Amino acid sequence: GTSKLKYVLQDARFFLIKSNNHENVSLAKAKGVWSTLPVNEKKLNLAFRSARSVILIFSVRESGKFQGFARLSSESHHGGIHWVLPAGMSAKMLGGVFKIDWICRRELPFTKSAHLTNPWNEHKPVKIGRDGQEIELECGTQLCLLFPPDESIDLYQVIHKM
């Protein structure tokens, strides 16, 4: 069913994550971590304190799809990842590491979200946006509800993290 999912998305904040390659998203799905540039890292830490759930919605550039969505379980932390680094990039830029809990690891093609526009990006289709773009509540909720159900995930523990 979808009731626990709707509860998790209740009053959540949503951010679009644009990865340059699939390898990093695969690594994030295996290890439950994400890293972004310093500008987006600061925005996500602020949002984590402000909302009962912060949702990251992933899209690999040129894939034409979203690859799933996850909930932040922590602010970024350093010390204690073999990211594939794009042109330029640098390991120090990706140094902050967030822990995340996947809510859906299934794909959604951009063709299925063409009816959703994001007020925080000039009402462009939600697939359009740079890495870190915030997605307004209603559009974010409807976008997440479009993904195929991921029956391998139990949201009971996620609800407890809240």
Q: Which residues bind ligand IUA (CB under 6 A)?
A: 18-21, 24, 35-37, 83-84, 86, 89, 94, 131
Minimum distance, C-beta of residue 17 to ligand IUA, in the bound complex (Å): 7
34 is in an annotated binding site: yes
Minimum distance, C-beta of residue 95 to ligand IUA, in the bound complex (Å): 11
State which residue, 18 or 112, has the beta carbon closest to ligand IUA: 18
State which residue, 97 or 153, has the beta carbon closest to ligand IUA: 97
List, in order, residues 6 or more apart from 51 with CB less than 8 Å away: 11, 12, 13
Minimum distance, C-beta of residue 3 to ligand IUA, in the bound complex (Å): 32
> C-alpha 97: how far from its chain's center?
14
102 is in an annotated binding site: no
Minimum distance, C-beta of residue 67 to ligand IUA, in the bound complex (Å): 12
118 is in an annotated binding site: no
State which residue, 21 or 74, has the beta carbon closest to ligand IUA: 21
Which single residue brings its beta carbon nearest to ligand IUA? 20
Nearest Cα neighbor of 4 from 99, 71, 57, 72 is 71
C-alpha span between 48 and 60 (Å, rounded): 23
State which residue, 43 or 112, has the beta carbon closest to ligand IUA: 43
50 is in an annotated binding site: no
State which residue, 32 or 142, has the beta carbon closest to ligand IUA: 32
Binding residue ranges for RNA: 18-20, 34-35, 83, 131
